[PDB]
Amino acid sequence: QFEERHLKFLQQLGKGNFGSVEMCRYDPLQDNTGEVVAVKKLQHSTEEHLRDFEREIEILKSLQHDNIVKYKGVCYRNLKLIMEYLPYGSLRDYLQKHKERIDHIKLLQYTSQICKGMEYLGTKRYIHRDLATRNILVENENRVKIGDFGLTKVLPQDKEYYKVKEPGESPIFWYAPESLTESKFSVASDVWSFGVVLYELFTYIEKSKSPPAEFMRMIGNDKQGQMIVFHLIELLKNNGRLPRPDGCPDEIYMIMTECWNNNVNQRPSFRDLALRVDQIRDNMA
Numbered sequence: 001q002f003e004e005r006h007l008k009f010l011q012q013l014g015k016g017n018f019g020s021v022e023m024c025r026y027d028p029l030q031d032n033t034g035e036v037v038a039v040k041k042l043q044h045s046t047e048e049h050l051r052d053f054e055r056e057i058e059i060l061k062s063l064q065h066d067n068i069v070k071y072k073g074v075c076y077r078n079l080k081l082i083m084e085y086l087p088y089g090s091l092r093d094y095l096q097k098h099k100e101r102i103d104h105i106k107l108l109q110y111t112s113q114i115c116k117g118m119e120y121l122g123t124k125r126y127i128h129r130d131l132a133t134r135n136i137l138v139e140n141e142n143r144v145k146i147g148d149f150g151l152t153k154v155l156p157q158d159k160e161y162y163k164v165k166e167p168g169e170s171p172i173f174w175y176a177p178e179s180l181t182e183s184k185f186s187v188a189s190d191v192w193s194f195g196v197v198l199y200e201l202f203t204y205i206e207k208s209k210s211p212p213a214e215f216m217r218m219i220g221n222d223k224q225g226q227m228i229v230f231h232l233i234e235l236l237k238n239n240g241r242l243p244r245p246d247g248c249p250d251e252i253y254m255i256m257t258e259c260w261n262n263n264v265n266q267r268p269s270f271r272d273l274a275l276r277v278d279q280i281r282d283n284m285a
C-alpha cells in the first residue's frame, strides 16, 4: 500500500470529468530514491462521485495490458488512485509538439495499440464511453496506452448496451448518434468514438480542424445551448460527417467513415479494425 505522508507533490498534470491527476514522488525512505507516480483524486468529494471512483479503481485494477496505464495502488475518505507515470503525457499534447517528427505509419502504430487495448476492454464487457486523444497517454515514442477510465461502465450481463445520462458537460462531438438520442453506450459507440480518435490523429490536433470546430462550422456558430445537441443529431441523421483530414489517405478515411455508421450493427469490430490497420501499416512498410 501507499501512505499519504510519503506522497510528495511535484505538479498538477490535469483535470478531466470530475477527476484531477497530479505528478508525485512516492518517497517512503525520504532519501529521494522513490518512484515518480501519477495520482488521481476527485476534484470535489461527494458520495455519488466516491462510489463511481471506487468502481473506476476496481475497473483499472482488473486491467493488465501493454496498452492500458498500470494500476499501482490506492492511498486513503480523500481516496487517491496511484498509477504508473507515463513520461510523454497525453497523445493529444505529444502529437502537437512532434507534428513534424510523427508520420502516417507511426500514427497507425498508435492506432493499432488503441485497437488492441479497446478489444481487451470488450473482452471484459467494459465500455470506455470517452475515447479521445486527451485520454490516451504516451509511454515512449513507440507505445501509447489508454490512460483514464473515469466514464467506464460494465455492461449488464443480459444486454449489449448500457443507458446512462450523467450531469455535466458530455463530449458530444465524439458521441455516437444513439448515445446523443437514447444515452446508449456499447462496444459499437466506442468504435464510433475510435473513428473520431483516428480523425484527431490525422488532423495532427490542428485547432481549426478539431471535431467541435468542424461540427460547429457545419451546424452553424449561431447555435447555442441545448440546441447544439439537436442540430448535431439532425446533421448525423442526414449523414453529415467530419471531413477527410489534410493528407489523409482514402483507405484511412474509409476506416473512419465505416466507424461512423448510423447502423450500430454495421460498425466494424475492434479485432477487424486492428487487422485492417496492421495490413495498411504492412503495405506502407
Ligand SMILES: CCn1c(C(=O)N(C2CC2)C2CC2)cc2c3c(ncn3C)c(NCCCOC)nc21
Pocket: 013, 014, 015, 016, 017, 019, 020, 021, 023, 038, 069, 083, 084, 085, 086, 087, 088, 089, 090, 134, 135, 136, 137, 147, 148, 150
Ligand atoms: C495529460 C495529463 N495527464 C492525465 C490527465 O489529466 N487525465 C485527466 C483525467 C484527469 C487523463 C489521463 C488522461 C493523467 C496523466 C498521467 C500521466 N502519466 C500517467 N497518468 C495517469 C501523465 N504524464 C504527463 C507527463 C509530463 O509530466 C510533466 N499525464 C497525465
